[PDB]
Homo-oligomer: A and B are copies of this chain.
């Protein structure tokens, strides 16, 4: 339905192939990770210079 993904459900897909070393792998994506329509980065760089540089 258009409710779980719209809610932001983080879906995951697992697959097992013989050729793979671990024999198992997976990926995942949610609403945001699904082509983020917009970022919300708010990084803060505290103490840009001190002791270390």
Closest chain B residue to A36 by CB distance? B53
Write the A27-53 contact mask toward B (1 if CB under 8 angstroms, else 0): 000001001100101010100110001
User: Could you tell me the distance between the alpha carbons of A36 and B47 in the complex, rounded to whole angstroms?
Assistant: 11
How many chain A residues touch B (Cβ–Cβ < 8 Å)? 10
Oligomeric state, in number of copies? 2
Q: Which residue of B lies closest to A32 (CB)?
A: B53
Q: Judging by beta carbons under 8 Å apart, are B41 and A48 in contact?
A: yes
Contact among B36, B48, B49, B53 for A49, CB-based, below 8 A: B36
Asked if B39 and A48 make an inter-chain contact with CB atoms under 8 angstroms apart, the answer reads: yes
Partner of A43, one of B36, B39, B45: B45
Which residues on the B side are within 8 Å of A48 (C-beta)? 39, 41
